[PDB]
Structures are given as C-alpha cells and as structure tokens.
Write a protein that binds this DNA or RNA. Structure first.
Lengths: 179, 178, 179, 178
DNA sequence: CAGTGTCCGATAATTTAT
DNA sequence: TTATCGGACACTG
DNA sequence: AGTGTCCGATAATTTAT
DNA sequence: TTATCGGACACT
DNA sequence: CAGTGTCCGATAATTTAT
DNA sequence: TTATCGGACACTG
DNA sequence: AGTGTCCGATAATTTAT
DNA sequence: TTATCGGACACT
C-alpha cells in the first residue's frame, strides 16, 4: 500500500517535470519519488532496495520503467517476489495480479517490436544518406592547413600544441590522413 | 552449423521423443544437448559453444525456458551473439523482430495458464490435507521393533548394526512416541 | 448487472453439466441460463436478444463463447454496443473495460493458433495413415456378393430392394464399383 | 498475380505516399485500389476480383481495417478464398497461422491505444466547450441585413433572390433572435 | 402411359487426433 | 472422411 | 403560386496525440 | 461539433 | 637520462529519425 | 557516428 | 570411543490438469 | 510434501 513513485528521462527534452506532475496527483509525494536522468540507472537500484513487503509503486507509462523488454520483466519478477506492485498510470495495468503482469510483459514486447523496426528504418535511411553524399558526425574546427605548414617546416610536433593551443595527440593524427 | 536442444522434468522421460524430431530435422547427436532437470548445466555449455551464423532447435517452446523471464534473457543474449532458435512445434524463429516478440507473447500467456493451474493444484492439496490424507513417502522400517530394542536397554549404535539401517534414524524414532 | 449465463458443448462428452454447475455458484440461475448443444447456435441468438442496457453475462471459459476468433469479437463488439458484459470465469477477464475485451480478443487468437496448428498435425497424421494402409470411413455392412449374383441373374434392380430390404439407390452404385 | 491497396482519412491526403511504396514493391496502378473515406466501395471491388494464388499489399496495418473486428473478418474471408495480405511496414503475411494471429494481436492492442487516445480527445473537447469555446464553422452571411429585410416587411422569398443565398436559411435566421 | 438408370443432398456411422 | 437412405428428374421404352 | 416548417446532404469547422 | 445548402412536405 | 611517434578510452559535439 | 581531449607506454635517440 | 542432537542430500511419495 | 539416508558437530 505505502505508495512509491518512479520516473525517468533520456532525450534533450527533459520531459521530467510532466512525469512527476501526475505521480503526485495520483497520491504519492516527492518524499518518495525516484529519478534517473539517463546520461547508470542508479535512482532505480535505490528504489529497488527501499521497498519492502506490501509496498506499491507508480510509473507514468510502460516505457518509463524499462526500455528493454527482457529486464522490464526481471524487475517485475523480482518485484512480485518482494510483494511490490508497480502501476502503469497511462496504461492502467497492475503488476499485482497475474493477468496484470502477464499483460504488462505482453504490451512491452509488442511495443519494442515497434522500436526494433523503427531503428532498422532509421538506419536504412542513414545508409541511403551516407551513400547519397551527406557530411557525417562532427565538422573540422581547427585549420589543418595551419598545421600542415607547421610540419613541412620540420618543426617539433610538441611545440605546435602551444603555438596553436590545442591537443598534442591530434597534431599527429592530422598529418596521417593525407597519404 | 546447426544445433539441437532438449529437456525433461517428469519421471515420464519424454526425452527420447524430443531428440527423435531433432534428427528428423537435420541435427546429429554430435550437436545435440540435454538437461535432465533434477540445474541447467548442459544449456550453459551449448550457450558457450556457438558463434555467429548458427541456429538452435527445440521441439516445444516451454522446453527452452519454463519461466517467461529468463527465456527472453537467453534469446536476447542469443541474438546478440548471432544465433537463433527455431521451435519446430510452433514454427517460430528468433532470427527476426516479430519472431522474437512472438516467442515472448506466446510464452507469457503460456504461463498465466501454467501459473493458474499450479494454484489449482495447490487448492487440491489444500482440500486433501484437510480432509485427512497422508502425504510423503510411507514408513517402512519396523519401528515397534526398534522401540522394543531400546525398551530392552540396548545400545542405540548396536541397533543400527543389527538392523541394516541408519543410526540417526534410530534416535529420531524414539523421540517419536512421547 | 442483472446477470445472465451461457454455456455450450460439442463432443460426445456432454460436459455440459459441469459448465452450468458453476454458472449458478457464480450467482446466476437457470431461469436465465442459455444452451446450444452443437449438433445452429440458436440458444445464443435468443440470449443475444433477451439482453438489454446494463446487463451482465457469464461464460465458463474463453472457448465457450465462440470457437472462431473472428466472430468471438463480433459478439463482444455488438455486446459492448448494447452495454452488456460477459466474463470468462476461468480466465477472469471483463468484456466491460477496454483492456478487458482487448485482452479477451488477445487470448483468443493466441489460442486458435494452437488449434490451427493442431488440425494441421492431425491431418498430417491422417495422410501418413491413409498412405500407410489403414481402412477409412465406414465399413461395408451388406454383402455385395449377394447383390452381384442377383444382377448377373439379369434380375430387375427394383425387385432386389425388397428381396434384400435395403435402399434401391445403393443397389445400382454397388454394381458400378467393379469395372 | 499480385495486388496493392491503400486508404486515407485526413485532409492530409498521405495517399500519394502509400501508393509510391506499392510500386516500389512490384504492383502497378493496373492492380492498385483506393478508398478515400468520406463508404469502403473500392475495397469490395478488390475483394470481388481475386482468386486462389493471389497476394494483396497495404503499407500500414491499420490501413486495411481501422476496427480490429472486421479486420479479421476480411482476412478470414481472404484466407478461405486463397489470398493473403502482406503488410510492408510491419512485414507480416496472413499466408500463415502465426501471421494471421500476429496480424490480429498487433491490431487489438493498436486499438486500445487508438481508443484511449480518442477518449482523451473528447476530454479535451469537454474541457474546452465548458471554458467557453465556439465550435463548428463560423457564421458568414450578414444577418443584421437579412433581419433588416424582414423588419422592412419584405417577402422572405424576395430576400433569397436579392442576396445570392438560400431561402430556408432566411427563415431560420429570423427565429434566431427572439 | 411405369420401370430402369443418374444423380444429388441430407442423415447415420466411422476414423484421427486432443 | 465414406455408406446408405430417402428422394428427384429424365429418358427410355 | 407562394409563404412558412422541418428534415438530411455538404461545408466548414474545432480537438487530439 | 454548428451553418448552410439543397430540398421536400404541409398549409393559406 | 626527455623528445618523438603509436595508440587507446573516456568526453563533447554532431547526425538521422520519431 | 566522427573530433578532440586527456592521458599511457615504448622506443628511440 | 561412543552416546545423543541436529542439519542437509536422496528417496519415495502425493496432487494436478 | 514427509522418511530415510548419509553425515557433521557438541558433550560425557
């Protein structure tokens, strides 16, 4: 019964404020609301150990507990073992029954099958972009023309890293590209 | 490279049967593995001797993992390595997205049944132990004789040599009829 | 609320007595318990029309409503339209929620996928039995040796159907087999 | 023989897009059909012009049938005839057992979402109509002029010819300001 | 004109699987 | 599935 | 004829992730 | 959803 | 003995998709 | 994904 | 040594569709 | 499940 609360975020959109907002309006106070800001899921492990027999948790929706269906279960399993139940406020399913957890784990694998496809289409769309002729990753920031002139000079490589206040390791690798 | 896996639980060793189908699929006992759950060692070994481009087989689904949870755990560890299990009875391959999903759902449901029926078994145990049924293995050793061999004033150790039976039992037997 | 009850049977094992047995112990009386003995699902159609807004039904398990997932839904859909809910006493799911019916229809298709496979293995096992050399269908009951002697006679075919008190149509077809 | 099917709902006619993929699969507009839901006639026609050994295509799953129920009804009628739909986005074929099943589950769940979100839309309509928002199409015709053309004592029919507008509306307009 | 042969569909009796 | 049972026509004679 | 009511088809609207 | 359009009716 | 070149892993900056 | 940033060795001289 | 307790591994048990 | 087996301990 003695309700807990758990939420998370992972994107540049820290939609965390929203997550919490209802966890309160449900019944549970911050005094018992846990959070990982997926930069390592620490605040979860800690929640995992604060709970005891006949506790109850609350997670906004189905994705918010675990990303990977495989261990989304492990939690629930380990959780039901202790006697703790987590509800999916958006989905409205109880870890606590059978049918509940059963249909939790049901919905997850059916929802990852969406992500798993998404990522293939995301990557297929990056392989038709890389090959098309698009610039990748991060751009050159420091003039390599300034470095190559300072090496054809026959100048000591270590000296350059403070004439141009940059990393010494990059100096070398830069010269290695143009074969 | 292709592989076969099988398992058992009951005293009814349907093991010979599972293996048969495996050979009727193309895997030899040269690449077949078995665990007689009594402790899943033989599985670990198979899980340690397959690389990318390999395919495992099990007759029934439940056969790989009874519990839905660690079932995916394997399959996950498995798809990551490059291996995939086909199930002959249900005809699903972890070699895909849906496949993997459809292994999982199947098995979740599969358990809600397994788990509810389990409860029904325990209800049946409850409605039996209360009505007056004797559980466990029934007694064998002629106790009224052992008890007559203490009443004698004989060594308890002496008993356990005279009767080809265990000594620690002898003592327990006496502290049975208070 | 005003509870109803529905059960069915289809095999030589008329396990109907059992079906009813609990439909009562649930709360509903025979006064409102319906039955088709699948010899045509009439007693269902009638139940379908006796129910009104805010009624509630009860069916032993998931198979017992409908066999074919396709219309198992139609019922539920048509049923939820009226405001009537059917429960799956063995399964413990409510037509009444969403998640309920959703997970009813979930379980059915996953359970037919069992039957659909079964029948293929049943038939595969009949095709390896027919070819193996097993007698099929129904056995000859009336001596065809007695009929063939009564036709080589040049005897009128109609006459034979009352000398041997049998069907007149079979008389003919019998002679047609031995080419 | 292979076939293509597509559909639309929104004023955002993503129709041109669905068809594109169909051609990128191998079906010509010579064997492609479309319903612009405004009434699923074009489907019926396709359902009436395929025999055994044919295969239909739709981009998304929801596209065939929105409602989970009649979705299977089609697929059932379909497997019986000898035809089967592949869905390119999800990559599932009704040409199988699991396939058919896995079409269905997918679509059931798919709806629990569709249906719950629908409710959320209606909650948003409720929290808007109560706060004080004007729904429907906004008024156009200069009523204070029509009302000034009865106050005149002019024929109502006369109005509807003078202003290039409908007559029945004229009357309704007057019984608006009691 | 009425008996002989062709051809169904609806019923009863059987099999393989659980 | 396969066997009979009622029948329905349609020609034959 | 022509003045008044009372429908359903078509247009333009809003709300929602 | 509400506003207009086409109408089709029933009465002076 | 100390400067020159090889080679990581851990961090920050970027892209494609929703 | 790709760029730098700190570093760690290991030889060279 | 040898007499008494108090564990866990192995055997034989039952209940269930 | 309860009954025996192997034991390993702590005390006269």
């Amino acid at each position: 019964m003695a309700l807990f609360g758990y939420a998370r975020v992972s994107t540049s959109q820290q939609s965390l404020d929203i997550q919490v907002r209802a966890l309160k309006d449900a019944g549970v106070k911050a005094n018992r609301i846990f959070t990982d800001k997926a930069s390592d899921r620490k605040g979860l492990d800690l929640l995992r150990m604060k709970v005891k027999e006949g506790d109850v948790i609350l997670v906004k929706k189905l994705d918010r507990l675990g990303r990977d269906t495989a261990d989304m279960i492990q939690l629930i399993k380990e959780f039901d073992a202790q006697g703790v139940s987590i509800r999916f406020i958006d989905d409205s399913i109880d870890t606590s029954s059978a049918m509940g957890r059963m249909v939790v784990t049901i919905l997850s694998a059916v929802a990852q099958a969406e992500r798993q496809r998404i990522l293939q289409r995301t990557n297929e769309g990056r392989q038709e972009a890389m090959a098309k002729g698009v610039v990748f990753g991060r751009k050159r920031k420091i003039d390599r023309d300034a470095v190559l002139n300072m090496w054809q000079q026959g100048l000591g490589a270590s000296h350059i890293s403070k004439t141009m206040n940059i990393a010494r390791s990059t100096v070398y690798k830069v010269i290695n590209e143009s074969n």
